[PDB]
Amino acid sequence: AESHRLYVKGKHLSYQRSKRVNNPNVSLIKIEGVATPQDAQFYLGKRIAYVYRASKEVRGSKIRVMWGKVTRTHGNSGVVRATFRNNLPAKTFGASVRIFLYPSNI
Amino acid sequence: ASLPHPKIVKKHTKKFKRHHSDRYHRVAENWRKQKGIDSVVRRRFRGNISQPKIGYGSNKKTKFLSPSGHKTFLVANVKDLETLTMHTKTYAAEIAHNISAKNRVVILARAKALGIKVTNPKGRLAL
Amino acid sequence: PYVAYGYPSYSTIRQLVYKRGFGKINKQRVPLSDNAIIEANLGKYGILSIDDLIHEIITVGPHFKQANNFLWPFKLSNPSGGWGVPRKFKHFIQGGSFGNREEFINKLVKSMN
Amino acid sequence: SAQKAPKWYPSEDVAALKKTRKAARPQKLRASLVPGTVLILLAGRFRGKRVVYLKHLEDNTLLISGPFKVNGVPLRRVNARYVIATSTKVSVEGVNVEKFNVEYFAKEKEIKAERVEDQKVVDKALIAEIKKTPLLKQYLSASFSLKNGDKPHMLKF
Amino acid sequence: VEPVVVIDGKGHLVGRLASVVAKQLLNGQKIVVVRAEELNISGEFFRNKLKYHDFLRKATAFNKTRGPFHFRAPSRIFYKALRGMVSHKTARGKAALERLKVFEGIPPPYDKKKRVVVPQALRVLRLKPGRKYTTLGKLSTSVGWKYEDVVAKLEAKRKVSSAEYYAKKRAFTKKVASANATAAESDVAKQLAALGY
Amino acid sequence: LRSLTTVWAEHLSDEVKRRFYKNWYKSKKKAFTKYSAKYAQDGAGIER
RNA sequence: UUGGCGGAAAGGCCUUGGGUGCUUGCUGGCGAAUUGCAAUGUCAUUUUGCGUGGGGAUAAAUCAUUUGUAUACGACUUAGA
RNA sequence: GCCCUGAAAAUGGAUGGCGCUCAAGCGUGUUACCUAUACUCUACCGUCAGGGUUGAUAUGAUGCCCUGACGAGUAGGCAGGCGUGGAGGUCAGUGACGAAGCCUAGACCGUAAGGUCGGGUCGAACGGCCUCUAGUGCAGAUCUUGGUGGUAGUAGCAAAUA
RNA sequence: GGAAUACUGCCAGCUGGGACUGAGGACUGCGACGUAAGUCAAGGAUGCUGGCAUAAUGGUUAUAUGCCGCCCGUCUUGAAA
RNA sequence: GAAAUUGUUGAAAGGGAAGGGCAUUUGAUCAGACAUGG
Numbered sequence A: 001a002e003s004h005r006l007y008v009k010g011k012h013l014s015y016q017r018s019k020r021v022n023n024p025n026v027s028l029i030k031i032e033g034v035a036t037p038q039d040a041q042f043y044l045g046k047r048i049a050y051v052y053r054a055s056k057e058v059r060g061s062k063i064r065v066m067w068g069k070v071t072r073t074h075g076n077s078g079v080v081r082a083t084f085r086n087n088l089p090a091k092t093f094g095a096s097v098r099i100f101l102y103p104s105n106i
Numbered sequence B: 001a002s003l004p005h006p007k008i009v010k011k012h013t014k015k016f017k018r019h020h021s022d023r024y025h026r027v028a029e030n031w032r033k034q035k036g037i038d039s040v041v042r043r044r045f046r047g048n049i050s051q052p053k054i055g056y057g058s059n060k061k062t063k064f065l066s067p068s069g070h071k072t073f074l075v076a077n078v079k080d081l082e083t084l085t086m087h088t089k090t091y092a093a094e095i096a097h098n099i100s101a102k103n104r105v106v107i108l109a110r111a112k113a114l115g116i117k118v119t120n121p122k123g124r125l126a127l
Numbered sequence C: 001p002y003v004a005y006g007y008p009s010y011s012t013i014r015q016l017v018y019k020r021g022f023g024k025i026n027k028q029r030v031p032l033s034d035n036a037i038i039e040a041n042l043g044k045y046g047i048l049s050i051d052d053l054i055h056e057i058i059t060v061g062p063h064f065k066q067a068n069n070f071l072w073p074f075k076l077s078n079p080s081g082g083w084g085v086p087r088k089f090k091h092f093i094q095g096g097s098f099g100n101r102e103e104f105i106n107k108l109v110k111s112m113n
Numbered sequence D: 001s002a003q004k005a006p007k008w009y010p011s012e013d014v015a016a017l018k019k020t021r022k023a024a025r026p027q028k029l030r031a032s033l034v035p036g037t038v039l040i041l042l043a044g045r046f047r048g049k050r051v052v053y054l055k056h057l058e059d060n061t062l063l064i065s066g067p068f069k070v071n072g073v074p075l076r077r078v079n080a081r082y083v084i085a086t087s088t089k090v091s092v093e094g095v096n097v098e099k100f101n102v103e104y105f106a107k108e109k110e111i112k113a114e115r116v117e118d119q120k121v122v123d124k125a126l127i128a129e130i131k132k133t134p135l136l137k138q139y140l141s142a143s144f145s146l147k148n149g150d151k152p153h154m155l156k157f
Numbered sequence E: 001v002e003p004v005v006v007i008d009g010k011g012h013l014v015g016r017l018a019s020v021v022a023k024q025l026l027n028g029q030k031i032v033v034v035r036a037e038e039l040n041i042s043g044e045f046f047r048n049k050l051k052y053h054d055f056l057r058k059a060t061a062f063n064k065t066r067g068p069f070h071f072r073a074p075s076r077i078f079y080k081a082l083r084g085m086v087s088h089k090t091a092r093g094k095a096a097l098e099r100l101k102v103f104e105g106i107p108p109p110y111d112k113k114k115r116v117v118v119p120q121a122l123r124v125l126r127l128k129p130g131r132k133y134t135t136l137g138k139l140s141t142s143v144g145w146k147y148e149d150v151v152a153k154l155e156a157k158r159k160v161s162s163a164e165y166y167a168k169k170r171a172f173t174k175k176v177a178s179a180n181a182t183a184a185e186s187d188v189a190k191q192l193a194a195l196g197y
Numbered sequence F: 001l002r003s004l005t006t007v008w009a010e011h012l013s014d015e016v017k018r019r020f021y022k023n024w025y026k027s028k029k030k031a032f033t034k035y036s037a038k039y040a041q042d043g044a045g046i047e048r
Numbered sequence G: 001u002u003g004g005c006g007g008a009a010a011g012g013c014c015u016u017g018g019g020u021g022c023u024u025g026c027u028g029g030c031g032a033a034u035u036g037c038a039a040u041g042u043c044a045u046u047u048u049g050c051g052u053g054g055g056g057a058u059a060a061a062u063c064a065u066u067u068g069u070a071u072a073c074g075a076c077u078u079a080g081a
Numbered sequence H: 001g002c003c004c005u006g007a008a009a010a011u012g013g014a015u016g017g018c019g020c021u022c023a024a025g026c027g028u029g030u031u032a033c034c035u036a037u038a039c040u041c042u043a044c045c046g047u048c049a050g051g052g053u054u055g056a057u058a059u060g061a062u063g064c065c066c067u068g069a070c071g072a073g074u075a076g077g078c079a080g081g082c083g084u085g086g087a088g089g090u091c092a093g094u095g096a097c098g099a100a101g102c103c104u105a106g107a108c109c110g111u112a113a114g115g116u117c118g119g120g121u122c123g124a125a126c127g128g129c130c131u132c133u134a135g136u137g138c139a140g141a142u143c144u145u146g147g148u149g150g151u152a153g154u155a156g157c158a159a160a161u162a
Numbered sequence I: 001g002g003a004a005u006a007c008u009g010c011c012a013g014c015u016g017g018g019a020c021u022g023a024g025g026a027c028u029g030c031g032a033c034g035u036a037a038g039u040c041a042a043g044g045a046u047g048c049u050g051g052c053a054u055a056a057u058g059g060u061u062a063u064a065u066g067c068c069g070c071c072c073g074u075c076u077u078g079a080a081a
Numbered sequence J: 001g002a003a004a005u006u007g008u009u010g011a012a013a014g015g016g017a018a019g020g021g022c023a024u025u026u027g028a029u030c031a032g033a034c035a036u037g038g
């Protein structure tokens, strides 16, 4: 209607890392409303999409989407680990990501 | 058109360029193992270039297969080509660089008629 | 100094042999997937089952030397859920791990299985 | 000769597959999906729409109506994992559903006059029931959307 | 959630406000801090003063011009603490600091915008009673900040207009709840409370 | 301290106008010419 | 469209006045499919170039020359329709 | 006990850094959590070991197949390989319809040494396999010779009156 | 006096969500469900549906971004020195 | 007619060196895969 959103807002925070060494193959995601690993278990398995713009066209459109799935839970604050088909650009840190409602077990 | 085979897995696609062949022009990229006593590459300190070792070896099943799946065979003439008649789904024929343009139309012709894949058709080929 | 240990329960032994149970045949670490493997080897002692092995272990008894020696040493993962301590190499009585924790070996070994 | 001929070469005989043991068992369904249960479509063409579950089909999808005269959705396959099952339901007692099956939707444009009646048929039962409980027509008529503050790990549906 | 968050610096605690703001930026949250002169620091004025003088002590010997730069104003005293908690010599951090603004007083765009508070950086909630704490602006002025009175002078003026704005705003919410009376007893009322509204 | 507005008198001595020019002799001396219209309009823009 | 208020970076805030479009406050009549069981999606927002339709305006500066309140060279400062 | 005095050094400066005061300090307790080339499971490369198998029906018994364990490394040892000049043998090998060389932010193969191909430039020779043989592999040696840079349009081109 | 409850422990108790993996390639094994015909999750993934050739996808290369990475060679107990 | 080194043109980058490793966005560039009734 005035709002078409079928997904939960998100943020790409960091790769998985130790103090001095990171692992681009996994990404840590902050999800709106998810404050505890309890809550984040609901979004485990869900599909995420990073949406970005370009110059060239794919089909009629300059908009492209990177796809990945929520994998496990991260820490005590409701962060979530995730893995995308291709790793996220790492400029993407602090950029919005989209956590969908499917696959749905409701 | 070739024996089915599992997914080819290359395990290290990058080149293993010799250390510092980026630094001094006199140093060719052809790999060379660092013998030096202090060398950070030899001692494998974090952040340096990774060296060739045996663990990188290709799967014995997918080794030597080209993206098509044919282990390729070098062919200098039609007699060479015809070694591949039974093994058409195994191997593939690569015309040598020095074979002239006449015999290339000739070798191609027999390879087609024989059902053998030429890796490098459109060889010295006019128009 | 280098080990933690204690007194294993029936389960702990059973689940250790069922999941991780292997045996030694001319070197050759061999999983016990069939009592035939056991009987082929421990049969001269009796012990044709996998629970015959388990029995001969927990009850100790006459052939425990060879019944236990038949068993390959158990390769275990790190404790799922941590070691419970901050620092392992203080004794169980003081700081945890590294020693004879008696019955508490079961909670640990089971989490390492 | 350029290269020297191999001493071996392999067999070009393709090998027969080993005989596999995997049975195809019937699919257990989420307890939340009992025919008559309203659904929320999370993906695809019709995403956002509120629909009505009709039958579990044997290709594993879900029969769907919504019905057409309300939200515009026709009788449709949909996948169980792309749906949220809401806790509101309509009574399905008066819907045939028997004919509709896998090969019904088999790919054989002009909409087949068969289908166009079938929707008029099926939905004629639905709406009459949907009419029975107030505001449900408006409900299925609307689209589902997430609003600021909505938390799907909290929201009941 | 929200594009930009205005934080009222007053009665907050420098290091803890800095810590929460830094993560926001690194996580993409645009931030603006207002009334940085009413920000606080634990410890009594003398201490947090002498502390500054040590900072003041350090400069590149051969050229004081390339040495550590000692910024007096409260917003800058704040930004230092914040920039110290961001990895600012890299591109990421640079970008993140671009997401931040800091002002003493509360300047026009933000003066009519809603301002929030960061409880875990808040002084009264955090510090134990009886512990002494410094007010940033007063310390900032003792090290040579020149703008304190002007900020205060304009702050007093702003507080007048904001008072009158709130006077109208309240009086309207009166006349909104006044006319809400009849519907408070209406049928749609009981309808709504049934579901919790 | 910030400069809010500047208001100029209607007629500027040529000695001042000389100061605004690097090459005065060949310049067309457009001076304050359009600014003086603010007086010519009776008031207002100067007074405001 | 009428008025006010706003100089902290006010460039926004309150207001009159009519015109016009919608309104889910409520009651009707139609449409939606086959985009085929998800991959596809609303177009936002920055600069810049072609263009058309009318509005408005009609400069300097550098070089060379020149002064010595200046000057290693640049720079500085004067002078010349 | 904690804190305070005791408690003086030279560039400006370091609980790692910001900064923290019912701590983001000190003592103590209890849980959750983070991540090593380590541990567990699996795929793949190699090494070592044990077992089966030309009873065969082609194309390798130095094979083919099954199984288990293992993998740090200087000086150093050994192995299996890559590459260059020449030599016997062989492909009745390549080639003026273009050999060799060279150039290719082009392709493929090999863990690697390396191998192969396309395109360009080129002009008269050259390669595969089996063996033989060495004046056989370069980044250094203030190495040798030859060529070329930055320094740099810079130091300078101001004694001997014009 | 009769329970309840905590705590520790066992069940070859029943179930929901997520993740990675699918090595092998006719049959030979050990089994389980069977009154039986036979069926199976029992010595390693199959079934189904869809999507892609102005191309999905994969290689290279340049640039960007996160984290990381001191000059080799040499002697030396110890060299980026 | 190689290299050092240099001119022009084209492309890209550039806040007190540069070059390297992993990963990915972006661009450029290459590819292997299409025959079954008309």
Ligand SMILES: NC[C@@H]1O[C@H](O[C@H]2[C@@H](O)[C@H](O[C@@H]3[C@@H](O)[C@H](N)C[C@H](N)[C@H]3O[C@H]3O[C@H](CO)[C@@H](O)[C@H](O)[C@H]3N)O[C@@H]2CO)[C@H](N)[C@@H](O)[C@@H]1O
Binding pocket: B021, B022, B023, B024, B025, B026, B027, B028, B029
């Ligand atoms: N060494 C093999 C080659 O190396 C090349 O890269 C390296 C060198 O060979 C090449 O040399 C560059 C050259 O590109 C460039 N056009 C000229 C430059 N002077 C050379 O580089 C040199 O220059 C500096 C001074 O400027 C010297 O102090 C220093 O010895 C060296 N870096 O530049 C790189 C760094 O010097 C390429 N990667 C490739 O052609 C090949 O791998």
Ligand SMILES: NC[C@@H]1O[C@H](O[C@H]2[C@@H](O)[C@H](O[C@@H]3[C@@H](O)[C@H](N)C[C@H](N)[C@H]3O[C@H]3O[C@H](CO)[C@@H](O)[C@H](O)[C@H]3N)O[C@@H]2CO)[C@H](N)[C@@H](O)[C@@H]1O
Binding pocket: H007, H015
């Ligand atoms: N963060 C600074 C803290 O002080 C430690 O270091 C301290 C000591 O190095 C040094 O102490 C010296 C003492 O050695 C020497 N006699 C000179 C000087 N007058 C003393 O300084 C001391 O002064 C009195 C006690 O005398 C104390 O109150 C004061 O805290 C302490 N700084 O004063 C330093 C600052 O207090 C460490 N840098 C660090 O681990 C600790 O956290």
Ligand SMILES: [Mg+2]
Binding pocket: A025, A085
């Ligand atoms: Mg990956």
Ligand SMILES: [Mg+2]
Binding pocket: none
């Ligand atoms: Mg990867």
Ligand SMILES: [Mg+2]
Binding pocket: none
């Ligand atoms: Mg799955």
Ligand SMILES: [Mg+2]
Binding pocket: A085, A086
């Ligand atoms: Mg990829």
Ligand SMILES: [Mg+2]
Binding pocket: none
């Ligand atoms: Mg990958």
Ligand SMILES: [Mg+2]
Binding pocket: none
């Ligand atoms: Mg990869």
Ligand SMILES: [Mg+2]
Binding pocket: B013
């Ligand atoms: Mg390779």
Ligand SMILES: [Mg+2]
Binding pocket: B014, B015, B016, B017, B049, B050
């Ligand atoms: Mg490498």
Ligand SMILES: [Mg+2]
Binding pocket: B029, B030
């Ligand atoms: Mg090379």
Ligand SMILES: [Mg+2]
Binding pocket: B037, B038
């Ligand atoms: Mg050493």
Ligand SMILES: [Mg+2]
Binding pocket: B097
């Ligand atoms: Mg070539």
Ligand SMILES: [Mg+2]
Binding pocket: C081
């Ligand atoms: Mg855990």
Ligand SMILES: [Mg+2]
Binding pocket: C085, C086, C087
């Ligand atoms: Mg620990």
Ligand SMILES: [Mg+2]
Binding pocket: C086
């Ligand atoms: Mg701890």
